[PDB]
Structures are given as structure tokens and as C-alpha cells.
Amino acid sequence: HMSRVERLPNGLVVALEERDFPGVAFQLLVPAGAVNDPEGMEGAAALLEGWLWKGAGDLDARALAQALDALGVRRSSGAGLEYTAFAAAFLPEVLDEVFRLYALLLTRPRLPEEGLEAVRSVALQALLSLEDQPARKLLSELRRKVFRSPHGREPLGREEGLKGARAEALKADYRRRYTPKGAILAVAGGVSWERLRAALEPFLAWEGEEALYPAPELSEPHRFVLRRPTAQVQIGLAYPDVGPEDPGFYAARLALEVLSGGMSSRLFTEVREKRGLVYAVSAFPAGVKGQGLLMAYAGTTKERAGETLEVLRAEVERLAEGVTEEELSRAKVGLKTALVMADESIRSRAASMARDLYMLGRVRSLSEIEAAIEGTSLEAVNAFLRAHPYRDPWVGLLGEVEDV
Amino acid sequence: HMSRVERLPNGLVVALEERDFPGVAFQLLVPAGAVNDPEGMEGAAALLEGWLWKGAGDLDARALAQALDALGVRRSSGAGLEYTAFAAAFLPEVLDEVFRLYALLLTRPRLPEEGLEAVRSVALQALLSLEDQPARKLLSELRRKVFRSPHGREPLGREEGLKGARAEALKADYRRRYTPKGAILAVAGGVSWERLRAALEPFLAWEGEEALYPAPELSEPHRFVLRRPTAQVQIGLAYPDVGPEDPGFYAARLALEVLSGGMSSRLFTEVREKRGLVYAVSAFPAGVKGQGLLMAYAGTTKERAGETLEVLRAEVERLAEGVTEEELSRAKVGLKTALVMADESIRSRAASMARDLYMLGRVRSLSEIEAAIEGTSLEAVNAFLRAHPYRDPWVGLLGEVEDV
Numbered sequence: 001h002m003s004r005v006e007r008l009p010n011g012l013v014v015a016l017e018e019r020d021f022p023g024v025a026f027q028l029l030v031p032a033g034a035v036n037d038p039e040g041m042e043g044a045a046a047l048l049e050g051w052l053w054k055g056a057g058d059l060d061a062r063a064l065a066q067a068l069d070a071l072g073v074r075r076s077s078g079a080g081l082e083y084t085a086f087a088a089a090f091l092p093e094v095l096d097e098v099f100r101l102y103a104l105l106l107t108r109p110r111l112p113e114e115g116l117e118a119v120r121s122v123a124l125q126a127l128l129s130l131e132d133q134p135a136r137k138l139l140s141e142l143r144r145k146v147f148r149s150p151h152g153r154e155p156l157g158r159e160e161g162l163k164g165a166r167a168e169a170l171k172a173d174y175r176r177r178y179t180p181k182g183a184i185l186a187v188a189g190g191v192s193w194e195r196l197r198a199a200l201e202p203f204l205a206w207e208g209e210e211a212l213y214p215a216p217e218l219s220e221p222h223r224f225v226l227r228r229p230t231a232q233v234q235i236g237l238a239y240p241d242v243g244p245e246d247p248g249f250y251a252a253r254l255a256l257e258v259l260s261g262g263m264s265s266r267l268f269t270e271v272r273e274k275r276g277l278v279y280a281v282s283a284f285p286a287g288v289k290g291q292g293l294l295m296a297y298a299g300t301t302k303e304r305a306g307e308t309l310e311v312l313r314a315e316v317e318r319l320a321e322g323v324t325e326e327e328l329s330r331a332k333v334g335l336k337t338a339l340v341m342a343d344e345s346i347r348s349r350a351a352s353m354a355r356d357l358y359m360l361g362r363v364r365s366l367s368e369i370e371a372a373i374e375g376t377s378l379e380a381v382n383a384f385l386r387a388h389p390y391r392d393p394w395v396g397l398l399g400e401v402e403d404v
Numbered sequence: 405h406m407s408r409v410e411r412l413p414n415g416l417v418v419a420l421e422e423r424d425f426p427g428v429a430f431q432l433l434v435p436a437g438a439v440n441d442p443e444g445m446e447g448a449a450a451l452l453e454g455w456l457w458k459g460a461g462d463l464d465a466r467a468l469a470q471a472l473d474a475l476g477v478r479r480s481s482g483a484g485l486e487y488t489a490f491a492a493a494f495l496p497e498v499l500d501e502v503f504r505l506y507a508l509l510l511t512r513p514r515l516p517e518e519g520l521e522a523v524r525s526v527a528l529q530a531l532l533s534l535e536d537q538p539a540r541k542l543l544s545e546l547r548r549k550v551f552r553s554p555h556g557r558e559p560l561g562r563e564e565g566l567k568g569a570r571a572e573a574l575k576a577d578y579r580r581r582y583t584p585k586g587a588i589l590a591v592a593g594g595v596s597w598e599r600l601r602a603a604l605e606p607f608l609a610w611e612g613e614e615a616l617y618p619a620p621e622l623s624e625p626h627r628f629v630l631r632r633p634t635a636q637v638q639i640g641l642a643y644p645d646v647g648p649e650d651p652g653f654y655a656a657r658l659a660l661e662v663l664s665g666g667m668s669s670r671l672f673t674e675v676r677e678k679r680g681l682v683y684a685v686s687a688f689p690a691g692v693k694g695q696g697l698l699m700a701y702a703g704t705t706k707e708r709a710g711e712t713l714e715v716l717r718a719e720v721e722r723l724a725e726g727v728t729e730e731e732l733s734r735a736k737v738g739l740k741t742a743l744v745m746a747d748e749s750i751r752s753r754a755a756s757m758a759r760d761l762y763m764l765g766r767v768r769s770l771s772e773i774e775a776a777i778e779g780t781s782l783e784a785v786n787a788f789l790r791a792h793p794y795r796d797p798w799v800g801l802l803g804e805v806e807d808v
Contacts, residue, residue, distance in 0.1 A: 069737075125683040128705070132636055263457075263469035269469075278526070279533060
């Protein structure tokens with residue numbers, strides 16, 4: 001499997017990975033997200049994404065949904081921190097018409113003022129549900145404390161931002177941020193490059209200015225508490241980490257697999273198997289372009305929260321002492337299996353291609369990644385871990401926890 | 405793609421779907437679940453599944469996790485309502501050794517009394533987290549109200565059952581319910597039938613009695629309230645429905661796709677797009693072998709809960725009046741696309757094969773399903789919907805809601 005990438009004259013980056021499969025999937029990233037919402041309009045990208053689906057060209061909201069449903073398009077979309085993602089999957093016979101409708105949605109949305117109040121009401125319910133999801137609530141507050149910059153914002157918005165956003169300001173925001181310069185379209189499946197290029201002709205009309213991204217700025221590490229009457233205390237840790245834009249990435253990814261990648265990993269072994277402190281514990285990347293971040297999470301009772309946090313923090317920070325030959329061997333075979341399984345689906349491959357393009361400006365081949373991981377030595381991992389220890393986390397707790 | 409199915413001499417049903425893919429996945433269902441937990445030991449199947457992973461043969465808990473991690477096995481397992489499922493994915497070179505270790509886990513678990521207290525503590529945290537998940541909490545209480553029989557039980561157990569379960573009673577329960585008679589192993593991927601059969605030799609030793617399943621028994625429909633200080637009211641509806649074991653299944657599945665299967669569906673259109681009442685709304689099957697059930701869910705504010713419940717209930721019960729030619733056309737293309745995409749992954753195909761075997765005793769081919777759906781007429785769907793209207797739901801609310 002090989003990938004082909006091109007920048008169209010308007011700046012849209014399009015990538016294709018052809019496969020012998022009667023199906024096509026894409027992932028379209030538009031560079032409008034919470035990170036570049038207008039000041040005082042936290043939630044604009046969430047409102048824009050919902051407002052797009054209220055009609056395009058001659059189709060109103062219901063006719064647009066029917067038109068894509070009549071093509072068999074299985075789809076989802078949503079505004080994120082750094083971009084708004086649109087995912088679609090369909091059979092190859094409807095290729096031309098699917099792409100014509102998505103170009104219409106992006107470049108000629110109706111944006112009806114009547115439909116806006118339904119968009120706003122839906123967005124406010126989505127934001128409200130975060131309050132009933134203590135794990136997600138804690139980690140969202142955690143990233144907000146970590147960043148002084150807009151990279152701390154919640155992708156669902158803020159209540160006052162969603163409530164005060166006015167129609168004409170939102171339209172002006174749409175005309176500014178829904179730009180092809182910085183947008184990425186990644187496609188996988190049973191379509192040739194020539195047939196895909198002909199289908200993208202309606203996208204050539206899309207025009208815009210380069211998308212703005214503020215620089216990341218960390219706060220100073222500190223501990224914070226959200227006092228809530230939950231059944232379990234939510235514990236969250238955040239550490240600066242390397243992300244994909246680092247020559248040490250494969251070493252850090254192998255060390256992360258040792259820390260948290262399976263049943264024999266450090267966190268599962270110490271927090272759950274031996275001590276029985278939690279059902280849920282994990283460590284996972286949670287950063288942005290320009291600032292990687294390692295987040296750790298555990299849920300437990302308030303009686304065990306102190307010991308859980310101590311063990312969790314000890315395991316992350318002990319990683320600097322290195323991993324063993326056997327630990328590393330297991331990490332390489334596990335990641336290989338995960339990579340092969342995540343390559344199987346065209347939907348997940350389109351998503352991976354798009355993130356690679358966003359973060360690196362190129363698509364990494366599966367063969368390149370597997371060989372780089374297999375051929376990362378123990379000494380390389382140990383040396384990286386000594387030079388880059390995890391220290392000085394932000395600490396967040398949500399639950400029946402004391403504070404001053 | 406063709407499937408081969410055989411019952412081994414001990415009663416284990418094994419199915420294989422060979423594919424041109426350097427990967428293998430399976431789904432193993434063991435017929436121990438909450439539905440046949442011993443009286444007073446609600447949670448036994450949850451304890452057994454966790455206790456299995458505390459060692460098998462000469463391997464203790466940590467050595468067992470390392471042994472499977474050294475093979476690159478990506479895996480998950482959990483006790484459900486009707487069975488305990490074990491899922492694994494790995495590359496074909498480790499086939500023989502993976503299956504030898506899973507046969508060891510099932511037939512010669514160590515079940516150490518020392519490890520049991522960690523199993524119980526973990527299971528109690530899992531059950532406790534349900535209290536912080538209002539949507540899941542509501543739907544779990546809903547199914548409990550629907551069934552008088554054990555099909556109402558919560559798969560995570562009950563607090564008193566988990567707390568009082570004793571080691572020797574649990575071992576006796578393991579020897580009774582972990583039986584090959586009723587167990588199902590479904591495999592997909594790059595392994596031949598001959599190589600799979602040789603790998604399953606360690607499973608031939610497994611022996612047991614036929615698994616017991618009580619008959620389903622419904623309660624009488626009624627409304628119940630769980631008063632909780634949540635941000636959103638959780639609304640749940642439950643209706644008797646046909647399940648897979650019905651000649652009307654394809655008609656009902658097409659009607660369900662019209663009701664709730666996408667953006668142009670009845671529920672999304674009326675509850676969300678037009679009225680903006682919710683972010684989340686859905687209808688989905690939720691029944692057991694011998695008793696299908698249709699569940700509907702919506703989350704909203706207490707101010708809108710009355711109108712949301714009215715619209716939700718009206719749309720489900722209005723379905724009896726039929727669907728249109730266009731609605732049906734869209735449903736067929738959408739389901740076709742979903743079926744083709746759900747067939748792509750060997751992991752999801754192993755899971756589908758196993759449920760088919762559990763519910764029907766045979767594996768349905770993709771081609772058979774697609775043709776049956778494409779060739780279900782409007783008149784067939786209309787006639788089925790008139791003969792089987794959704795009426796008289798159980799109604800559950802969780803939130804700041806009044807009750808008497």
C-alpha cells in the first residue's frame with residue numbers, strides 16, 4: 001500500500017491510499033477549532049459545524065440529510081480543539097455525488113438564521129452533558145489548567161460563549177476560518193487517483209486565507225480540585241511530553257507502551273492487578289501541535305484516592321530509570337499487532353493519514369513505522385528516558401476532596 | 405468469503421471465516437453470565453472472569469499477562485448478561501501458542517484465594533462507576549424493571565452479591581458454568597481450517613454439562629423514576645420487539661433504520677434537528693435470546709423532559725403507520741454500506757459470527773443478509789409494522805423528576 005499526496009492550487013492538501021476494497025472513506029479536517037475561536041465566542045467552531053448541516057445550495061437541512069442518506073453515506077463530524085473533522089464512508093459508485101455535496105456544504109452553506117437557535121440549543125445540551133461525565137469533565141478542566149493559551153479551551157465551548165454568539169458575527173467567523181489553506185482531505189479505499197481528482201473539481205472553487213494558530217503556552221504546574229458529590233474520585237495527571245514532531249517519538253511511544261499499553265504494563269500491574277485500587281486507569285497522549293502532553297487517569301473511592309495518586313505518580317516518574325529487555329520486546333510485538341489491526345479499516349486509515357498530514361505534513365507508511373519501532377534499541381529508549389524524565393505534573397481531582 | 409462451522413466432540417462450536425489477511429481474531433463466548441449467576445451471588449460471572457486472569461497452569465497473574473503480551477495479543481474480556489466474551493487479535497505466527505494459553509485459562513485456572521480479594525475490589529469499583537454514568541445507570545435500571553426473570557440483572561453485579569461471594573462457592577460455580585456445551589469460538593483471518601483445528605487440540609480436554617438458561621419473563625409495563633441531582637434528565641423507553649429469531653427480522657431492522665439509523669431518520673429529525681431538544685437521542689435493540697426489546701434514549705434538561713418524552717414516544721408508536729418508498733430506499737442503501745464496512749474488520753466479523761451462532765446456531769453470510777435486505781418490499785415492511793405496533797412502553801426517568 002502506497003500513498004499519494006498533492007496540494008491543490010487553492011491550498012487544500014489531498015491524500016489517497018488506494019486499496020483493493022469495494023468501499024471508500026475519507027477524513028476532512030477544516031482548520032477551525034476551539035483553539036482559534038474568536039475571543040468571547042468560545043464555542044463558535046461548535047456552532048459553525050452544527051450550522052453547516054442546516055442546508056447547502058438549494059437543499060435545506062432535511063433535504064441535505066436525505067441526499068447524503070440516499071447515497072448510503074455513513075458519517076460523523078465535530079469541532080475539536082485544533083480543527084473540525086468530517087468523516088464519511090460510502091461505496092465507490094456514489095463517489096462523484098458525495099464529494100459534490102460536501103463541497104457544497106463547505107463552500108455554500110445556507111447558514112439560516114432560523115436554524116441557528118436549534119444549533120445553539122443542541123450545542124448547549126452537549127456542553128451540559130459534560131457535567132454528568134466526571135472523567136471527561138476532569139480531564140477537560142485539567143487541559144484548561146495546563147495551558148494559558150487557547151489550547152486549554154473546551155471544544156464544546158463555554159456556556160456564555162454559546163449563549164451570546166450572534167448570527168452575523170458567526171457568519172463572518174465562517175468566512176474567515178473555513179479556509180482550504182490548512183485544510184486536509186485524506187481518502188482510503190477502492191478509488192484511483194485519477195477518479196478522485198475528477199471528483200474533487202467542485203472543491204477547486206473553495207478559497208481563503210491561511211489559517212491562524214496561536215503558539216502554545218504552558219502555565220506553571222499546580223494542583224486543583226473540583227469538589228463534586230460523585231461516587232468516585234477522578235484523578236488526573238498531566239506532564240509535558242514529546243509529540244509526533246520529535247526525533248525521540250518512537251522511543252517515547254515504546255516507553256509509553258511499557259507504561260500503559262496492556263495487561264502486563266507498569267500502571268495496570270501496580271495500580272490494578274496487585275493492589276485492586278481501580279477499575280479504570282490509563283496514560284495516553286493529550287497534546288497539541290507544538291506541545292505534547294502525557295495524561296494519566298484513574299478512578300477510585302475517596303478512601304483510596306491518596307494511595308492511588310501516589311502509585312500512579314510513582315510509576316510515571318519511575319519510567320526515567322529505564323525499561324528491561326523483556327519489557328521492550330513485549331512492547332514491540334504489541335505495537336506491531338496494534339499497527340497491523342489499525343491499518344485494516346479504511347476509516348481508521350483515513351483518520352491516521354489526516355493526523356500525520358496535520359502534524360508532520362507527510363503520510364508515514366505502515367512499513368516505515370513498523371521498521372522504525374522494531375529497530376529502536378534498548379539503549380536508545382533508556383538514553384531518551386534519562387534525558388526526558390516525567391516530572392512536576394499538573395494534578396487534578398474531581399470528587400469529595402478537600403481544598404484551600 | 406465463506407464460513408465453516410463444526411461442533412467439537414465436547415460440544416464447543418467453532419467457526420472460521422478465512423481471509424487473505426496477515427492477522428487472526430477470535431471471539432470466545434462462555435455461557436456464564438449474570439442471567440445464570442447463582443441466587444444471592446449477583447456478580448459471580450464478573451468475579452469469575454476477573455479471577456481467571458489471576459493465573460493458569462504454572463503461570464501466575466503477572467506471568468500470564470506477560471506470556472500473552474509476548475505473543476502480541478491485543479485482547480479484552482468481560483462478563484455480560486447472557487455470556488462472558490473473550491476477544492483476542494494477533495498475527496498468524498503465534499496461533500498455536502495463543503490457543504494453548506487460552507485453553508489453559510479456561511480449563512486449568514489457578515483461582516488463587518489470595519488474588520480473589522483484588523478481583524472483588526476491582527469489581528466493586530466497576531459497579532460503583534455506574535453511579536457516575538447516568539445514561540448507563542438509567543438503561544440498566546430500565547432493563548431490570550422490564551424483566552421479572554434474571555434477564556433483568558446488571559452484568560456488573562450487585563454490591564451485596566460481590567461482597568458476600570465466597571471463594572469455595574465461586575470455584576464450585578466455575579466448575580458448573582464454564583462449560584464447552586453452549587460455548588462458541590468464532591475466528592476470522594489468515595488461518596486455514598486445518599491449521600485452526602490443530603491449534604484447538606488443547607480445547608478437546610474441556611468437558612462439562614449443558615449450560616442452563618432461564619426462560620424470559622416480562623413484568624407489566626410501568627413508569628419509574630430515579631431521583632438524582634444530574635445536570636440532565638435521562639429518559640428511557642422500552643418496548644417488546646422481535647429479535648433475530650423471527651421471520652420478520654429484516655422488516656423490523658429496516659423499520660428501525662428508518663426510525664433511528666441516521667441523520668434523516670424519524671427521531672433525529674423530530675427531536676433534534678427541528679426542535680433542538682437534545683444532543684443525544686437513539687433507539688436500539690436491547691433484548692435477549694427469547695425476548696427482543698427496543699430501547700429508546702434521550703438526554704435533555706428537566707424543563708424540556710416532558711416535550712422530549714412526548715415526541716420520542718410519539719415517533720416510536722407512529723411507526724405502525726408505515727414508512728414511505730423514499731424512506732425505505734434510503735434505509736436499504738444505508739444498511740448496505742454499514743454491512744460492508746462492518747465486514748471489513750476481522751475483529752468485528754468474529755464478533756458478528758459469534759452472535760449469529762449464539763442466536764441462530766448458524767452463521768449468516770454477508771451476501772445472504774444484503775440480498776434479504778435489498779429484497780424486502782415496502783408492502784412487507786408496512787404489513788409487519790401494522791401487525792406489530794410498538795405500544796405500552798416501560799418508562800424510566802433519572803434526574804430531578806417528581807414521583808409518588
